[PDB]
């Protein structure tokens, strides 16, 4: 992009070079998402804020998604971890170099902390749609002492 001449230049091969093609140009906006922390809910509907399960893996069910990143933050150490996800998976239909068709799928990233200790933020910067259907967590729960 040339600022003075407000002209966008591209060297990519868009097809036939003897015709005129149309493109969409505009500014981009981020999408930010922070799901709530997970606490074990007993069958009698009582909560234990200290008895917190250890989250092992988090599974996201998606229907339409571009490549994006997930940010992991820790409230005690302050370290930040980034897990980058892409919509390219080998052997799938949306693997042609032509265009990545919007297809469903799943993505898993690890957390490796207590549920109350860390938060995970979903960040997407892409013109394509991002549809988040369900969120599932998997891990270990050790009841040291029984609930009331």
């Amino acid at each position: 992009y040339d600022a003075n001449t407000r002209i966008l230049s591209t060297k990519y091969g868009l097809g036939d070079t003897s015709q005129i093609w149309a493109a969409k140009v505009g500014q981009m906006y981020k999408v930010e998402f922070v799901p709530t922390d997970v606490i074990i809910r007993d069958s009698q509907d009582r909560v234990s804020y200290q008895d917190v399960p250890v989250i092992g893996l988090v599974h996201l069910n998606l229907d339409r998604y571009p490549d994006f990143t997930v940010e992991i933050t820790n409230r005690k150490s302050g370290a930040v971890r980034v897990a980058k996800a892409s919509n390219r998976v080998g052997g799938a239909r949306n693997n042609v170099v032509g265009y990545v068709k919007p297809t469903s799928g799943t993505f898993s990233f690890p957390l490796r902390a207590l549920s109350t200790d860390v938060e995970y933020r979903i960040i997407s910067i892409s013109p394509h749609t991002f549809q988040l259907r369900d969120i599932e967590w998997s891990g270990s729960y050790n009841p040291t002492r029984k609930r009331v």
Partner: protein, 172 residues
């Protein structure tokens, strides 16, 4: 391969070159580079221009007996195409990156080397030969047998003088 030796002299101002590869055989116009040999060493040519996708034309006819070469030099420090998140892969960049990586390997297969190139460790000859080497200029240069032959012949010439100029001593 990458280089083309061309001997065009007299009247003719344009030369045609073909490179190993696909189509025009070069990634960009700036890759093409021209060298002229003045009878002692090679140096960059002047006044040449790129006429089209192939073949180049000089502004003036080359002098009789002039020899030039057309070489293909590509950037070695950087990959041709760098990819970014959330962009689309096109066949031009994907094929060219393999072409570029194949091209740079071919350049070393022609004996082309960059300036400021020197070996760090000694290399083993493995019982082979050295050919077509001129006699050296400075003490750090290597030697061919021609210098050894001349020294041996010069040694023989004095040895013959050693004989005859001592021979007349014997009858004395």
């Amino acid at each position: 391969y990458s280089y083309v030796e061309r001997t065009g002299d007299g009247v003719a101002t344009t030369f045609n070159f073909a490179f190993t590869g696909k189509g025009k055989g070069y990634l960009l116009a700036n890759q093409i580079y021209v060298e002229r040999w003045d009878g002692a060493s090679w140096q960059s040519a002047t006044g040449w221009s790129l006429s089209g996708t192939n073949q180049i034309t000089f502004l003036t006819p080359l002098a009789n007996g002039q020899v030039i070469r057309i070489r293909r030099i590509a950037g070695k420090d950087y990959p041709f195409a760098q990819f970014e998140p959330g962009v689309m892969l096109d066949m031009a960049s994907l094929n060219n990156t393999f072409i570029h990586l194949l091209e740079i390997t071919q350049e070393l297969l022609d004996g082309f080397y960059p300036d400021g190139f020197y070996l760090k460790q000694d290399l083993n000859m493995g019982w082979n030969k050295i050919v077509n080497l001129m006699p050296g200029t400075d003490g750090g240069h290597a030697v061919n047998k021609t210098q050894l032959d001349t020294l041996s012949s010069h040694v023989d010439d004095v040895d013959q003088k050693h004989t005859i100029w001592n021979d007349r001593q014997d009858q004395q």
